Amino acid sequence: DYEIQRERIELGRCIGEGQFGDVHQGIYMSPAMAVAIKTCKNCTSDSVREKFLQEALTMRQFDHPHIVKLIGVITENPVWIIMELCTLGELRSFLQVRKFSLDLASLILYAYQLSTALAYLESKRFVHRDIAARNVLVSATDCVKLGDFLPIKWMAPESINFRRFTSASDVWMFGVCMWEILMHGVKPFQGVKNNDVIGRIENGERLPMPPNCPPTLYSLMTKCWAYDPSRRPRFTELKAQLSTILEEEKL
C-alpha cells in the first residue's frame, strides 16, 4: 500500500522543480525520515493529476539500492509523490565542489554503483537514454543513485545520426559518465560546439585518459565508445570489471 497519510509528511523547503510543480524536501514521520516531495500545482485538473501520478506508477516498477525509490503517494488534493531524498544533490556539482577531497577509490565506487543500477535496468530491457553525471544523485559520500528518469556530448553516434537509443547507446553514455566522474565533473567536449561533436567521434577522437585512471578502467571506457554498437560491452561485464578494478584500488 503506497498511500501515505498527509499528517505523516512535514513539508520543508523547496529544493527544485519538475514539469508539474515545485519539489520540496521534507520529513516522513511515524509513531523520522528525510524525503523528497513532488507537488502538482494543478492537480485539481484530472488529466494533469493522471499524468503526474504516472511518474509514481513508473518508479514503483524498479527496486534497486542505486535507483531512487518511490516511498508513497498522497492522492487527495494537493496530490504529492513522496520519493527517497538524495541529500547531497546532483553528482556533477558534488564532484566539482569536493574534487580535492575525493580519492580515486570513491570515484571508481560511484562508477561501479551506477553500473549495478544500469545492469538492473538492462535486465528489464529498459533504455535510459540520458546517462550523464547531472542525472545522478548523491545519497551519501559512498552512495550514488539514478533518479527522475538533446545531450549531444554524451550521445552515441547512432543516437546523434539516426535517433536510435538502445542498450548499446546507453553503454556509450555510461562510458562518458565514467569519464565525467574520473574528471571530477568536467564536461565532455568542454568548449566544443554541439554540431562539431559527431565529426570528432567519426574521426575517432575519444575523450582522453583521465589522470590517475587505472589502465584497465580506461580500456573499458574505450570499449564503451566502440563505433560499432555490437562491439560495446554489456552492463553485466561492466559491473564485474569495475568490481575487480575497485578491489585493486582499495588494496
Swiss-Prot record:
Residues 9-246 form the Protein kinase domain. It comes from the Eukaryota. Transmembrane segments: none annotated. It is found in: Cell junction, Focal adhesion; Cell membrane; Cytoplasm, Perinuclear region; Cytoplasm, Cell cortex. Phosphorylated on tyrosine residues upon activation, e.g. upon integrin signaling. Isoform 2 is phosphorylated on serine or threonine residues, but apparently not on tyrosine residues. Disulfide bonds: none annotated. The active site is at residue 130. ATP binds at residues 15-21, 38, 84-86. Non-receptor protein-tyrosine kinase that plays an essential role in regulating cell migration, adhesion, spreading, reorganization of the actin cytoskeleton, formation and disassembly of focal adhesions and cell protrusions, cell cycle progression, cell proliferation and apoptosis. Required for early embryonic development, embryonic angiogenesis, normal cardiomyocyte migration and proliferation, and normal heart development. Regulates axon growth and neuronal cell migration, axon branching and synapse formation; required for normal development of the nervous system. The C-terminal region is the site of focal adhesion targeting (FAT) sequence which mediates the localization of FAK1 to focal adhesions. Belongs to the protein kinase superfamily. Tyr protein kinase family. FAK subfamily. Interacts with ARHGAP26, GRB7, DCC, PIK3R1, PXN and SRC. Interacts with the ARP2/3 complex. This is Focal adhesion kinase 1. The gene is PTK2. The chain holds residues 414 to 685 of 1053 of the full protein.
